[PDB]
């Protein structure tokens, strides 16, 4: 792709902002989770530190392409999901917080970042390669915890999914056209996110009917 074209740079201004904002919010989210889960405080602080590194990497990706990120756009993009995390944290709802960041958001990021890698400029490709591998660890942390605590967490997981999965589906739709400009096909993003999230839900303990119901709250939101 022509990384120096005005159409590419325009789309990149919003995409770069979105990823910078997402990493920043993930840093705050894992730091908040560290307070909520004393037994895993050290591990969660380590995950937060990785997010800070990711944020700085993506800031450099924008600099490399001479793109100024549209942070106002990115704030608004995350706002509804972010405020839901904040409310859950205030309520001491650790399960909801874990689902939002560790599973929903990390799965969205894994799906999107892996689709970006083969169309990314060489500088951004190497950065993204390093970021996605941390994302596997983040998702794995959430899966391990929720699986180990499945019975106690299940009802809240269902409630949290119903409220928050539609928000990420709306985000997926909002980003689709800019992502297409960057060479990332919407069909791939949708499939890969649905597969990743569905598999995560199966891995933690949900049945086929439960996975379909949970996934449908997202798909039906469009
Ligand atoms: C600037 C280069 C990265 C471009 C990748 C394409 C991204 C397009 C989809 C937008 C969704 C990004 C979600 C980011 C959330 C990050 C959360 C986390 O790090 O745990
Ligand atoms: Fe990250
Ligand atoms: Fe992460």
Domains of the chain, CATH where assigned: 5-222 (1.20.1260.10)
Q: Which protein residue's CA is at the shortest distance from atom 5 of ligand 1? A: 113
Positions at the binding site for Fe cation: 23, 51, 54, 106, 138
Q: Which chain residues have CB less than 5 Å from ligand 2, an ion?
A: 23, 51, 54
Ligand 3 centre to CA of 24 (Å) is 10
Spatial separation of the C-alpha atoms in residues 193 and 186, rounded to whole Å? 11
Q: Are 75 and 21 in contact (CB under 8 A)?
A: yes
Q: Are 94 and 37 in contact (CB under 8 A)?
A: yes
Q: Are 204 and 146 in contact (CB under 8 A)?
A: yes
CA dihedral (139, 95, 84, 212) positive or negative = positive
Spatial separation of the C-alpha atoms in residues 89 and 114, rounded to whole Å? 30
Spatial separation of the C-alpha atoms in residues 186 and 14, rounded to whole Å? 16
Report CA-CA distances (Å) from 31 to 89, 98, 115, 140, 165.
11, 12, 28, 17, 22
Spatial separation of the C-alpha atoms in residues 17 and 74, rounded to whole Å? 5
Q: Which protein residue's CA is at the shortest distance from atom 18 of ligand 1? A: 23
Q: Are 45 and 30 in contact (CB under 8 A)?
A: yes
Q: How was this structure determined?
A: X-ray
Q: Count other C-beta atoms under 10 Å from residue 204's C-beta.
A: 21
Spatial separation of the C-alpha atoms in residues 28 and 52, rounded to whole Å? 9
Atom of ligand 1 nearest to the CA of 29: 20
Spatial separation of the C-alpha atoms in residues 43 and 70, rounded to whole Å? 32
Q: Count other C-beta atoms under 10 Å from residue 185's C-beta.
A: 13
Spatial separation of the C-alpha atoms in residues 169 and 91, rounded to whole Å? 25
Q: Are 100 and 33 in contact (CB under 8 A)?
A: no
């Amino acid at each position: 792709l022509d990384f120096q074209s005005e159409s590419y740079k325009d789309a990149y201004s919003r995409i770069n902002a979105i990823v910078i904002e997402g990493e920043q919010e993930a840093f705050d989210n894992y730091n908040r989770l560290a307070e909520m889960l004393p037994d895993q405080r050290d591990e969660l602080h380590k995950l937060a530190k990785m997010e800070q590194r990711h944020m700085k990497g993506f800031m450099a990706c924008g600099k490399n392409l001479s793109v100024t990120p549209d942070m106002g756009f990115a704030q608004k993009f995350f706002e509804r999901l972010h405020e839901n995390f904040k409310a859950a944290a205030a309520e001491g709802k650790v399960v909801t917080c874990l689902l939002i960041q560790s599973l929903i958001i990390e799965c969205f990021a894994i799906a999107a970042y892996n689709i970006y890698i083969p169309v990314a400029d060489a500088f951004a490709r190497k950065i993204t390669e390093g970021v996605v591998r941390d994302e596997y660890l983040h998702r794995n942390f959430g899966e391990e915890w929720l699986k180990a605590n499945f019975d106690a967490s299940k009802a809240e997981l269902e409630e949290a999914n119903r409220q928050n999965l539609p928000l990420v589906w709306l985000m997926l739709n909002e980003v689709a056209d800019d992502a297409r400009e960057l060479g990332m096909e919407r069909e791939s993003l949708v499939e890969d996110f649905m597969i990743a999230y569905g598999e995560a839900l199966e891995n933690i303990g949900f049945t086929t009917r439960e996975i379909m119901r949970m996934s449908a709250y997202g798909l039906a939101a469009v």
